[PDB]
């Protein structure tokens, strides 16, 4: 017997969303990722009716997705974190109404792995170097520079390898025209495996480390480390240089902490709770995801709880020194 | 203790002589009995290096699948003096096989083992798959019975055999088609 397969209704589930300018237009095309599917939408400034410009199936499990831009560049490419051992850089040709495969690079084995990258994906604000990472042991970097014709060329990889180290999340860091930085959440289980008592199960804090790419030395050295008080799930870029301070926000259990280097001391704030809540007090809270709103005038952040509570995160700074943090209830 | 270790398993029969020396018997007991997995081959603890030529000297050289036999190549292949060989170079004749390209476009299309629960080991060939209740053709011929084999009439009177106690043979406690009169 033989069976021919047909899809009829394509999956409506949306795992990821990235907003960039893919046509070189002042409008913002929204590239969203259905489960096995790559998808491209066009919302309308006036009526807001969301036009689907493209829907394509990649025949592979999408893992993470990020959009980026060359420095001061006109247009935006796409980086596809995949389940294969290949990162691919894509460009949507507005005319042809379909994507082209701009770059195909093979960093390792196939399928969702423990040590194989593609899991977590970060990129520099200036688009110099994109950093790709697995859950454990392997963190790789591809450096990007436009060619003589200003068409994108990808470099050779690098290696961040650190033994027996779990990576919670990786977020690009803002340093304008500098040696790029990266915020890697890490933890070491090597303390836990050699501790028959079970003490290392507790009393082990996830280490926040900033790697520094260095163009001139063309390797990636561990530079910054601080132990995190409590375990946060994810991090947030804080645009630095001209606009705002350069630092990272850390979303932690029942807290958010701006935690940065230089002389900058950490700033913690509790995650506010609603008056007269019916839930188990034993159930804490963190934030799910965050979408930064970046404006030539100002900037802020948007956070959400399990319960769906979006807050507007703000920074109170003295010059480049942030003194405190202000969170106003935004919506739900 | 190899004794009490046999009380902890659904199929303790899996535990064997050297099994009690295992570095982790308290698991291997639970693995070896896993549902569809297959046993380890037995040729070790036999020092004979997996084979000898005793039973292997009585085997046929080879025999073709019937699909290849009907073709007719078998008769084509079958002798020569040396000067005939240097004549075979100087003379040479062409087209000795002269196969039918229709036939060899036919057989393997138009015309043309074991399950997972089995694995081969050294000496095993015929036996498991002549048993009480199962005999070969010819010996049927010497016996000369038309389609029970008649001493399973006396397996009525004298009783079920001590040697194969689990026995069932047709018509008695085993309620039979072709050759095989007992299982």
């Amino acid at each position: 017997m033989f069976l021919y397969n047909l899809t009829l209704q394509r999956a409506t589930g949306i795992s990821f969303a990235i907003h960039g300018n893919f046509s070189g237009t002042k409008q913002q095309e929204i590239v969203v990722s259905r489960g096995k599917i790559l998808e491209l939408l066009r919302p309308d400034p006036n009526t807001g009716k969301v036009h689907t410009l493209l829907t394509v199936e990649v025949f592979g499990v999408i893992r993470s997705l990020m959009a980026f831009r060359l420095t001061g560049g006109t247009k935006d490419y796409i980086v596809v974190g995949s389940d294969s051992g290949r990162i691919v850089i894509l460009e949507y040709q507005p005319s042809k109404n379909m994507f082209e495969k701009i770059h195909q690079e093979t960093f390792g084995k196939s399928g969702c792995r423990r040590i194989v990258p593609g899991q977590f994906l970060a990129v520099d604000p200036k688009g110099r170097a994109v950093m790709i990472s697995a859950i454990e042991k392997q963190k790789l970097v591809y450096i990007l520079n436009r060619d003589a014709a200003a068409r994108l060329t990808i470099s050779s990889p690098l290696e961040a390898h650190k033994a027996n180290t779990l990576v919670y999340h990786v977020v690009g860091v803002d340093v304008g025209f500098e040696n790029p930085m990266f915020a890697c959440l890490e933890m070491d289980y090597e303390e836990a495996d050699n501790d028959p008592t079970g003490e290392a199960a507790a009393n082990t804090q996830q280490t926040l480390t900033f790697y520094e790419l260095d163009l001139g030395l063309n390797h990636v050295v561990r530079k910054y480390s601080e132990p995190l008080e409590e375990h946060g799930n994810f991090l947030i870029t804080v645009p630095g240089g001209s606009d705002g301070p350069s630092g990272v926000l850390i979303c932690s259990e029942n807290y958010i902490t701006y935690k940065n280097f230089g002389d900058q001391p950490d700033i913690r704030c509790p995650i506010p709770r609603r008056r007269n809540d019916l839930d188990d007090p034993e159930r804490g809270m963190i934030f799910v995801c965050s979408a930064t709103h970046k404006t030539k005038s100002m900037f802020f952040f948007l956070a959400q709880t399990e319960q769906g509570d979006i807050f507007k995160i703000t920074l109170e700074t003295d010059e480049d020194m942030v003194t405190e943090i202000r969170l106003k209830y935004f919506d739900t | 203790t190899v004794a009490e270790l046999k009380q902890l398993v659904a199929r303790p029969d899996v535990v064997e002589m050297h099994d009690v020396t295992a570095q982790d018997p308290k698991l291997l007991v639970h693995l070896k009995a896993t549902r569809n997995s297959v046993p380890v081959p037995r040729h070790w603890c036999f020092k004979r290096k997996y084979l000898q030529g005793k039973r292997g000297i009585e085997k046929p050289p080879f025999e073709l699948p019937d699909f290849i036999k009907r073709t007719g190549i078998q008769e084509m292949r079958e002798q020569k003096t040396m000067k005939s060989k240097m004549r075979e170079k100087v003379r040479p004749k062409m087209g000795k096989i002269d196969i039918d390209y229709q036939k060899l476009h036919d057989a393997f299309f138009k015309w043309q083992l074991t399950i997972h629960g089995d694995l081969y080991y050294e000496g095993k060939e015929f036996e498991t798959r002549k048993k009480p209740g199962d005999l070969s053709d010819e010996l049927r011929i010497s016996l000369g019975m038309p389609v029970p084999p008649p001493w399973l009439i006396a397996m009525q009177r004298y009783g079920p055999p001590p040697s194969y106690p689990n026995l069932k043979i047709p018509g008695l406690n085993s309620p039979l088609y072709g050759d095989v009169f007992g299982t």
């Binding site: - | 009480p132 005999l135 010497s142 016996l143 001493w151 004298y158 001590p162 040697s163």
Partner: protein
């Protein structure tokens, strides 16, 4: 009783149809059916060693029902 003596056979019979033949009753552990070298043919009498004795005494009871080539087969203890 572990062994039996078997008379009155035809040489087309060999050690194999004895193997198969008496294991129909109960397994022959050790088979002995002489091959005569000189004229390369069998006289037709057999010796059978079993697992233990019970096999072979049941074998005395049941055993002499076999008929090899239309003809009678002797089985007695030994």
């Amino acid at each position: 009783d572990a062994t039996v003596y078997v008379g009155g056979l035809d040489e087309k019979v060999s050690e194999p149809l004895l193997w198969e033949l008496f294991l129909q009753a109960g397994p022959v552990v050790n088979t002995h059916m002489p091959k005569d070298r000189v004229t390369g043919q069998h006289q037709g009498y057999g010796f059978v060693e079993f697992l233990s004795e019970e096999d072979a005494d049941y074998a005395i009871k049941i055993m002499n029902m076999i008929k090899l080539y239309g003809k009678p087969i002797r089985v007695n203890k030994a």
